[PDB]
Protein: Inorganic phosphate transporter 1-11
Organism: Oryza sativa subsp. japonica
Amino acid sequence: QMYHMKAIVIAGMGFFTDAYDLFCISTVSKLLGRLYYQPDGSTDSKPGALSKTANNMVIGVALVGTLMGQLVFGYFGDKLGRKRVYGVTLILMAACAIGSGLSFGSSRKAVIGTLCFFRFWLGFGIGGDYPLSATIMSEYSNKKTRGAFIAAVFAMQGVGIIFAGLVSMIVSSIFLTYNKAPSYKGNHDLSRQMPAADYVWRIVLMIGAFPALATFYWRMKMPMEFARRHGLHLIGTTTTWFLLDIAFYSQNLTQKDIFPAMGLISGAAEVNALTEMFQISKASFLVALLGTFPGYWVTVALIDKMGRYMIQLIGFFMMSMFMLAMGILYDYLKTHHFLFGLLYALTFFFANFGPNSTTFVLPAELFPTRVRSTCHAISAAAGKAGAIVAAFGIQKLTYNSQVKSIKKALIILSITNMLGFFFTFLVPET
Amino acid sequence: QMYHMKAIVIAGMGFFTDAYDLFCISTVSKLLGRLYYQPDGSTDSKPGALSKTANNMVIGVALVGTLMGQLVFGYFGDKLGRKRVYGVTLILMAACAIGSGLSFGSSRKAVIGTLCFFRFWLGFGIGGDYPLSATIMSEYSNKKTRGAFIAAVFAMQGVGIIFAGLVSMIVSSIFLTYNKAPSYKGNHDLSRQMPAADYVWRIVLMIGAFPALATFYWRMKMPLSMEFARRHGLHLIGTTTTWFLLDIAFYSQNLTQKDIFPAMGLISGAAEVNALTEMFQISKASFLVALLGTFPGYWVTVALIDKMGRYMIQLIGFFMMSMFMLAMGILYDYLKTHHFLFGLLYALTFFFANFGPNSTTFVLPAELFPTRVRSTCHAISAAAGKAGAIVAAFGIQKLTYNSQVKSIKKALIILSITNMLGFFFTFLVPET
């Protein structure tokens, strides 16, 4: 029946909101670069985009905020109350989501500064939310089985990822009907669509306030020696979270750069300002629907039949092998745009089928109650550090650059995945 | 001891916040015109200012929201409790005050629409508040002195206006030192000072968020029948008309300060002065008038509130309002060349404005209107007052804004007639 579905959605609303808020920023970055950096006339190259520093800062402010918000709310926030922290975080995220669409001026520096300032505290709220709070897993999930509880609630991160692309596509298509302009190869100034394109990204960013209020409503009506013996378990958990997050965020954020270099989306200086965003949204929507979404539904039915160890092991192995194959066959995959789609999508599939639905129960069924919270917080902090490295690291190689740099970045991604496969051996299952 | 004024401020924080929010908009009302309405080149007259419709909307939409919010959190708002309405209104105030400083775009239409939208709900929160809370304060008001407490907590309006002028003064002075530009008579484009001046009014507007947080902190921890319409109906129409004719006069003489002064000495003309320093001059004049004239009214009222009563003081206040303002109206031509007595007359008009009627108007419905239907009469009287403020913002402002010397004369004459009519109607409320 649908009562189980209602319970699953009520539990996973937090993950859905977090995923939407964190992954709605990839689609609108190109529009911001095209609007606030392209000058009138003086054309010598592709349409202006964000500088490396500005692009990296815009992408990573939210994640740095998540780190410094989670640390504070965890260490110095346990003496205030669950309902109180829920309310504060869920109102802060909504307020910052609404404020991200409003600017303090007209200059590009003022707009960028306001956007970064509001994204910082949006990420602060997201990190301090601690979306699922360990309680429901310390419930039925920790005791009897972890079969269709964790892997079912986490199926909403995929839903949020799809919905981000869906709303971007809907808004861009609606604004595209009444806004027709020649491509950048034609009239250079008119391709900006400045009077109209200045509102679409604001609308996309401020749509995210609705999920925060929805989860507010839906959740405010619901009432050293031990470490020495454990030893390598701590480093195992931290590494298995770090080397997963560094790949997941890298492959979700670098979507806007790999596709223009590999078929699919056409050349940058051949498309209008809005329809390019629409094409990127459609590509992301298709990849997240056919690739990412089936991963959770494959995972849910195999938690008990296969286990938790071998599934993660094979997931990491396929991650590494597919990444290495894509890196090696770059030149061949340039011409053939057909199988590149599936080579890119099965990476997401094996990520979802792999340790993506596995690294949170890893602290569970282990780490006895004496120091469980400290180890869980340490593992989460390691994951957030991996996310920050993904936003501020490999992005420096993938963004703009040339053919050699993206091949290199794929090489380090494959190496890191193989290292994670090596490191996930010192964690058995009982 | 400090306890007396500590309680006074802790009770009048709401009035101070309301006055600051409602009267901080007339200071930056010239800057918006000088920034978003003046085009480059084409210098034919004084620097461009807001259109009449836009100016009237910006000035009066907050008061319209005040009326609507009062009506809602009144007739459909008694099922939530005091704490709930306190919290929702005091958080709406802060949210809207913060949002008013941020724009949804670069076009003047988008900025104007965002400003009006975020001022509407600010007024909504203002009106759904009942600052003094003359229901908790009504328990003490059954039978005792109606002086010191109320007449002192009502003094917060003067200091709110003073602080609005002071903040505008401070920010304009700070931003003036770094940016120097010639007059509009000189380099027309440089007179705007666009890159620096686009932030000063924003900061002035968002500074008003702090009083909302302060009052939230200070007030979160503190735990119609035929016979009544015939025996008391005359009193009811008296209260409604008196509140109407007090609010129209007060809001007209406060909101049109930016138009009276430039046309009457004091501040220099329009098209010889930069954008920031004209704001500086207007802030200086308004601050001085509010300090010397507006402030002592409540203090002199609190001294003799019981020593004479609440009837004669209101009667005389209305009478001297009418006489002083008629004298301003008919002696305008002779007064055009000397400014000292003009400033003195304006200060005395404000002094007698806060002296007589302002204090007695608020507490008057409480002592009448027995508890059977007291709330309904108080609500209808407050609605009449808000309607009067709306009329002041959307009425006489039409004559005052642009004006052709005849229009300002007519505005003064109609205001004098209104105050005389209020003085006449004041006879239908005795004192016991």
About this structure: DSSP finds 22 helices and no strands in chain B.
